[PDB]
Amino acid sequence: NPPPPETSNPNKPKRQTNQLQYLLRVVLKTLWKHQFAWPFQQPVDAVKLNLPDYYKIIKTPMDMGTIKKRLENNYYWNAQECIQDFNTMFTNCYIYNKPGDDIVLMAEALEKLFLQKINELPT
Ligand SMILES: CCN1C(=O)c2cccc3c(S(=O)(=O)N4CCC[C@@H]4CO)ccc1c23
């Protein structure tokens, strides 16, 4: 396993924004409770899960546990940065797998709920 993504960085500029507040309180916390959320709640453990080729293929890993901690820690400057982390988590799943796989059916469901929730954000 490689080191997981950072959740703190003192030299990074950050802001507390009403859209970032919403991304934590509503968007992340709703997805988290979905029946298909559990494979995405922490970094991939290629050793436990016996996926030795995962980090040989995926070079920008991301997961909802990392996002949650970034949100709680005031890591982001704006909502587009957080939205980009979500998009990376979903794209990684489609790169490493194939259409029809159980994990892909799960990611497709969460991605549609995610887009429904960010369709309208607070001003
Ligand atoms: C989202 C990150 N991510 C992948 O890209 C991926 C590829 C193959 C299996 C898994 C598993 S799992 O073995 O625990 N399991 C969970 C249900 C489906 C799958 C078994 O079919 C958990 C998380 C994963 C994968």
Residue environment code for 60-93, b if the CB has 16+ CB neighbours within 10 A, otherwise e: ebbbbbbbbebbeeebbeebeebbebbebbbebb
Which residues form ligand 1's pocket by a CB distance below 6 Å? 39-40, 44, 49, 93, 96-97, 102-103
How far apart, in whole angstroms, are the C-alpha atoms of residue 92 and residue 5? 14
Look at the block and give the residue holding tokens 């990684």. Answer: 92
Residue to mutate, 1, 49, 95, ligand 1, most ligand atoms under 8 Å from C-beta:
49
44: CA distance to ligand 1 center in Å? Answer: 8
In order, the DSSP letters of 60-93 are S---HHHHHHHHHTT--SSHHHHHHHHHHHHHHH
Distance from Cα 23 to the centre of ligand 1, integer Å: 25
Q: How far apart are CA 93 and CA 71, in angstroms?
A: 22
Residue ranges and CATH numbers for the domains of the chain are: 17-121 (1.20.920.10)
Cα dist. 94→101, 114, 123 in Å?
A: 10, 16, 32
CA–CA dist 29, 32 (Å, integer): 5
CB-side neighbour CA atoms (13 Å) of 81: 15
